[PDB]
Structure 1
Amino acid sequence: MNLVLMGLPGAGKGTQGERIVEKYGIPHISTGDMFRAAMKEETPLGLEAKSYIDKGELVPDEVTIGIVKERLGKDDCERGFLLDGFPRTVAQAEALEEILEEMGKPIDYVINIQVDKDVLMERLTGRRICSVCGTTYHLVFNPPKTPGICDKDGGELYQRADDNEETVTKRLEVNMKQTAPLLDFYDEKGYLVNVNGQQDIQDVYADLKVLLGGLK
């Protein structure tokens, strides 16, 4: 089960990806999570990625492709993988094609989680994350029991540094710009599927199960 998740910022890739790997026995590989972990830990990768991420720009292709290639070579990817937020550009997709060709692990579905750009600011500015366990909430759409406090371990919730109006606007522009070309790229390959991401989380996941069961 070799999958790519794509979607505009806030469309629900992490939310769906976490659900997918809980059920299906494959690793969740998020380039955003990888970069942010590097930033949190102040590693050289973090220091390089930070100047781009803080502005809402894409990290350059060379390093991004490099870290994914190394990640996909690990034993935990032998039975499949869920790439979340990679590829994000046609160049990245072309590089990944070659990578997966030699592994004998070509993509089964590129899942485009479709969400109207007009609702994505609200998804992102309302996002809250636990400082302790990383569990994700939304102020309105998926709130904790006590505002500002995680249900699981009582950790304080915070707002991602890039989830402010200015940076979200940049992220949407940057990612929109790469979107139509990438959708066209995969559609021509034949395994792009669009899923309606503008439903309750449970209902988006239900639609996803109907497709993914064929790869179980």
Structure 2
Amino acid sequence: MEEKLKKTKIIFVVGGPGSGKGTQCEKIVQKYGYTHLSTGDLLRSEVSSGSARGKKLSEIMEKGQLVPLETVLDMLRDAMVAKVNTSKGFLIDGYPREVQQGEEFERRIGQPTLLLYVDAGPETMTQRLLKRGETSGRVDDNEETIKKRLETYYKATEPVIAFYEKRGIVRKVNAEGSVDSVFSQVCTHLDALK
């Protein structure tokens, strides 16, 4: 598992809803053949049971809502051991935004070798993201909450990223919307991902 990781690279890409990490983080494993780890399927294995867990998390992974490290980093490790044997690098998509969720990760998955932080504007993203409520149902369906919320995770994120800055592995990307523009930064990180 980690034994291979000590020499192998790993990527946990973080970001927000409507940012565009789900696009970039995929085409990477699809076009580059890089190993793919999604919290969607990683956690999926759990929800499959159909228990109260599959009731709550199953959707949390759909809308990309708050995922609990308990089920996230746990199945991620299970999903990690999958190819470390021949996997030179992993691509995780939809990673938490707080160290509380980061602490155990390094305990199950391994160590921070690379992280892609897909960033999105406050108002810009707020347009394609928050307005989603009309077709789904955002937090409060109003940019105000968007604001009061923007700082909730931003704070919780400062330490996470920071701790990853320690290893100089974090790699932020400007994805305030279209995946095309952001494709310019994320790519530069996939070339140096080593």
Q: Normalising by structure 1, report the TM-score.
A: 0.64
Is 1:3–1:82's contact at 8 Å kept on the other side of the alignment? Answer: yes
1:61 maps to which residue? Answer: 69
1:14 positional shift: 0.2
Three-state SS of the structure 2 residue aligned to 1:81 is strand
Cα RMSD of the aligned pairs, angstroms, is 3.9
1:182 positional shift: 1.3
Taking the aligned partners of 2:97 and 2:85, their CA distance within structure 1 comes to: 20
Three-state SS of the structure 1 residue aligned to 2:125 is helix
1:52 positional shift: 6.6
Q: 1:37 to 1:121 in 2, by over 3 A?
A: farther
1:108 maps to which residue? Answer: 113
Alignment equivalent of 2:39, drawn from 28, 31, 45: 31
1:2 maps to which residue? Answer: 10
Is 2:77–2:109's contact at 8 Å kept on the other side of the alignment? Answer: no
Three-state SS of the structure 1 residue aligned to 2:129 is helix
1:50 positional shift: 5.7
Q: 1:78 to 1:122 in 2, by over 3 A?
A: farther
Alignment equivalent of 1:191, drawn from 133, 156, 169: 169
Matched, 1:165 2:174: no
Q: 1:24 to 1:47 in 2, by over 3 A?
A: same
1:133 maps to which residue? Answer: none
TM alignment of 1:70-109, pairs within 5 A: 70-75=78-83, 78-79=86-87, 80-101=89-110, 106-109=111-114
Is 2:69–2:101's contact at 8 Å kept on the other side of the alignment? Answer: yes
Taking the aligned partners of 1:95 and 1:161, their CA distance within structure 2 comes to: 31
* Structure 1: 5+ residue stretches without partners: 128-157
Taking the aligned partners of 1:119 and 1:194, their CA distance within structure 2 comes to: 17
1:123 positional shift: 2.2
The amino acid across from 1:85 in the alignment is G
Q: 1:109 to 1:65 in 2, by over 3 A?
A: closer
Taking the aligned partners of 1:35 and 1:164, their CA distance within structure 2 comes to: 26
**Residues 185-214 of structure 1: CA distance to partner in whole angstroms, max 9, x if unpaired?**
212222112222236422311322222123
Taking the aligned partners of 1:215 and 1:188, their CA distance within structure 2 comes to: 16
Is 2:43–2:71's contact at 8 Å kept on the other side of the alignment? Answer: no
**How many residue pairs end up in the alignment?**
182
Alignment equivalent of 2:122, drawn from 99, 110, 117: 117
**Residues 130-182 of structure 1: CA distance to partner in whole angstroms, max 9, x if unpaired?**
xxxxxxxxxxxxxxxxxxxxxxxxxxxx945658726x849756533422221
Is 1:8–1:176's contact at 8 Å kept on the other side of the alignment? Answer: no
